[PDB]
Amino acid sequence: DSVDYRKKGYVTPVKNQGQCGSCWAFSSVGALEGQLKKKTGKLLNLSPQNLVDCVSENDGCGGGYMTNAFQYVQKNRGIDSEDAYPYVGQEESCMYNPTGKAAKCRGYREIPEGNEKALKRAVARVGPVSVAIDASLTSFQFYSKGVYYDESCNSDNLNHAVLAVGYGIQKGNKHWIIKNSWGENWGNKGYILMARNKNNACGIANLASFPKM
């Protein structure tokens, strides 16, 4: 019982948010990319900058929620491609243009809070799912390999948005496959395997959602 959507064409290359707290935007566009592949058979890089600049309910480089982003894409009737609205790592005025529309959204769903079983079902039945975790531990930041687990990780401190692109097991330890946005240089080629079914480690299932398309 495992799935890895990277093998299935559902996941774009790892991005780098740079000096901007825009991880929520990369998480959101990641989920939307997965759904684009699932619904149309093909994907491309969607634009986190469009979300950074135009989701007024969020705080641009100062943070935000993924659900607010999905909600924006729904009400705006679209989101631009990366190529049509390039990432510059700082908030600017909203420059959305319908000509560059590359995806749409018809709403979203939130996973039941704290429920890793429901999160697993969502990853299996939907595709990549946007999640929020505590990434503040030093041990998280210098991760390079294996299945990450640190007891001191705080499930009530959801300070970093990332993307669950699969799940499985490695040498007996169950895990989530997690796409970060700190560049391909971070972790294992941009990814981290995070402990699964170990009492909601790092709050992996506390703020999880996916877009409808």
Please choose, from the candidates 123, 142, 113, the residue with its C-alpha nearest in 3D space to the C-alpha of residue 203: 113
| Nearest one of 177, 27, 207 to 111, comparing CA atoms | 207
SS3 of 152-182: the string is: CCCCCCCCEEEEEEEEEEECCEEEEEEECCE
Q: If you write DSSP's letter for every residue of 127-156 in order, what string do you get?
A: -SEEEEE---SHHHHT--SSEE--TT--TT
The Cα–Cα gap between 201 and 186 comes to 20
Residue type, 15: K
In angstroms, how far apart are the furthest CA atoms of the chain? 49
Q: List C-alpha distances in Å: 138 to 24, 40, 110.
A: 21, 40, 29
Work out the angle between the directed axes of helices 66-75 and 23-40 (0-180°, nearest 10): 50
C-alpha 100/C-alpha 181 separation (Å) is 23
Q: Indicate the length of the chain as a whole number.
A: 213
100, two tokens: 């560059």
Q: Which residue has the tokens 């790592």?
A: 89
Experimental method: X-ray
Distance between CA atoms of 160 and 76, rounded to whole angstroms?
Answer: 25
Domain boundaries, given as residue ranges, for the chain: 1-213
Q: How far apart, in whole angstroms, are the C-alpha atoms of residue 32 and residue 182? A: 19
Phi-psi region of 47 (alpha: psi -120 to 50; beta: other; left: phi over 0): beta
Cβ atoms of 108 and 67 closer than 8 Å: yes
Instruction: Give the catalytic positions in this structure.
Output: 23, 160, 180
**Residues ≥6 apart with Cβ < 8 Å to 141:** 135
Closest CA to 193 of 185, 201, 12: 201
Q: Given 3.90.70.10, 3.20.10.10, 3.40.50.300, 3.20.20.70, which CATH number is that of 1-213?
A: 3.90.70.10
CA atoms within 13 A on the CB side of 81: 11
Question: Hey, what amino acid is at 33?
Answer: E
DSSP state of 203: G
In sequence order, what DSSP letters do the residues of 75-106 get, joined into one string?
HTT-EEBTTTS---SS-------GGGEEE---
Strands 191-195 and 147-148: parallel
